């Protein structure tokens, strides 16, 4: 049982499209900073390390930002306005933070299409999709139903339903694609392909994202004293099992998406998508859609 | 059977806090006009009636809105960014637009909270009230969360799940209510108090409001040869029946809104607000979440 236990989740490194600090609390003051933030923020880890977080904000957006930091309902208000400002120059970000074993974990990816309406096309995909997901007639419609509006709002070659088995084994159940890709439809596959800790950390973490499995791993830099591993199981960007990378490779795929099917409290199977030939880093508002269609689906798997 | 008889779709005249007109296909010539139109839209009926849209609209917005109403996805395009242009001046209207019995109509409400961003609101509350929509273990807790989810976002006075039985008579089966309501959890209703037609309507058309019960109702006018009554039945402004205003008036209620819960493709009950001592013009982005959430608790009729 090798496959079971890499401990994919302290990797200690990310993946360096967005950047991760971990903030104290109450004050803010970054404890760790991943070592890709001269590319992505304009600053080096030396100057964030020890420094409160208000200092790199632009000043009209850094109370409510700070305020936002700081509350219990932190998940409901993501994602978070972030605006860095460095030499008189702004950069615009969207933050995704959360609490976990005693962190407070700040993550930040770069806003897109900024031109156009924000959460407006949040707004029309769970409408569009929530009607066309009930108007699946079955298990087998409800699944066709998914994988073809995900593939719609994401670009991906592939987009499959996979089905767990009793002994977490798996079955290619739905699948749209474009023709480039070929046809995985019906295919089963073993259970460590998705081993133990894996799925354990997918019942809890019900989204994942590789949008190039080319990638050079940014190690998190922490404060003297604070370099134990981070424990980085609801980080959206942390780095993934090499191992996994090299299926993906030998697979033909470029970039992944999955989002976990949960019933009854377990996972039930995945949705999982794939760029076969590019890249595909997923918008925020189509990523977001896109889990919660998996929710909705979740949720009918009792019904259908 | 006086009570089904009533044909409250053809009432010839809407509330008038929005304003309703009918365009031709394609070339959108106005053919009705609801006559509160000086009072909303600063032109008379005169001025409008036979006059193309887009002499009406801000000329850099003029172009998609026009693709957009002619547009055979136009249910999924709505809201439409409608900006009204008199006298160099401009007001902003969600429009509302829709295709039924051969006719374009076209709905405008006034923009809210025009500073706020677009439609976050709406992603905070269909994620936020997905959740304690599937936290619910059974029925009653269903109802429950989906009460407390639809006055906290509205702030109405009163929310209820009111369920119908197999003679058509209703059940307050669930409530969340602010102290100075009295409570109608437990009591049951005759058939009559929601007639067979509307109850027809309402399998088709799964929201209606009507923010104040106290109102002037504004007659449709139309150019000669046009004046056949006009089916308002998926019109959200639609007058409604002066009898069920005196119902509501009677109740001691100023202001009302109910939403469809379907199951198996027939009406299982409705959710049901009331504003006690005041008026209540329930934004846009929070009507749509409301009945999102509606639809959603359908789905989940099945199940739980
Ligand atoms: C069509 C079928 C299909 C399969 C089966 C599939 C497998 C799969 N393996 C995964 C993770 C993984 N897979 C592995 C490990 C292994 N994998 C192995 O084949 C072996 C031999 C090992 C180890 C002995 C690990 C460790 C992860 C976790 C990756 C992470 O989250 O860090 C994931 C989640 C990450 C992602 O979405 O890309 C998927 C979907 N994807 C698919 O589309
Ligand atoms: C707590 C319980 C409760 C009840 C029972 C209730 C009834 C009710 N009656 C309604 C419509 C109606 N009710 C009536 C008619 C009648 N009504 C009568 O009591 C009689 C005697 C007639 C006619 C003989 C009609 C015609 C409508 C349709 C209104 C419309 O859509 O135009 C509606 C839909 C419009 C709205 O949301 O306000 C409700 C919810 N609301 C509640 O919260």
New interface residues.
């Given amino acids: 049982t090798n496959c079971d236990r890499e401990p994919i989740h302290i990797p200690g490194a990310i993946q360096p499209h967005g950047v991760l600090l971990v903030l104290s609390e109450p004050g803010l003051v970054l404890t760790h900073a991943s070592e890709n933030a001269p590319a992505v923020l304009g600053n080096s880890a030396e100057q964030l390390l020890g420094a409160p977080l208000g200092h790199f904000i632009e000043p009209s957006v850094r109370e409510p930002l700070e305020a936002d930091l700081r509350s219990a309902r932190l998940k409901?208000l993501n994602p978070l306005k972030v605006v860095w400002r460095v030499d008189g120059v702004d950069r615009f970000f969207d933050g995704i933070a959360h609490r976990h074993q005693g962190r407070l974990i700040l993550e930040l990816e770069p806003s897109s299409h900024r031109e156009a309406?924000?959460?407006?096309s949040?707004?029309?995909a769970?409408?569009?999709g929530?009607?066309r997901?009930?108007d699946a007639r079955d298990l087998q419609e409800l699944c066709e139903a998914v994988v073809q509006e995900v593939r719609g709002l994401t670009g991906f070659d592939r987009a499959i339903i996979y089905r767990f088995d009793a002994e977490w084994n798996g079955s290619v159940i739905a699948e749209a694609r474009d023709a480039r890709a070929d046809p995985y439809l019906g295919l089963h596959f073993p259970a460590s392909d998705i081993p133990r800790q894996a799925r354990e950390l997918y019942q809890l973490n019900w989204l994942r994202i590789i949008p190039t499995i080319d990638y050079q791993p940014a190690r998190v830099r922490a404060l003297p004293g604070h370099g134990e591993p981070l424990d980085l199981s609801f980080s959206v960007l942390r780095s993934v099992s090499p191992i996994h990378l090299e299926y993906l490779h030998n697979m033909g795929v470029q970039a992944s998406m999955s989002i976990s099917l949960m019933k009854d409290g377990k996972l039930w199977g995945l949705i999982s998508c794939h760029q076969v030939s590019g890249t595909r880093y997923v918008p925020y508002e189509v990523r977001?859609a896109c889990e919660?269609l998996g929710?909705?689906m979740?949720?009918?798997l009792?019904?259908?």
């Fill in positions: 409901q309406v924000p959460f407006l949040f707004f029309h769970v409408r569009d929530l009607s997901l009930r977001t919660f929710e909705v979740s949720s009918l009792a019904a259908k």
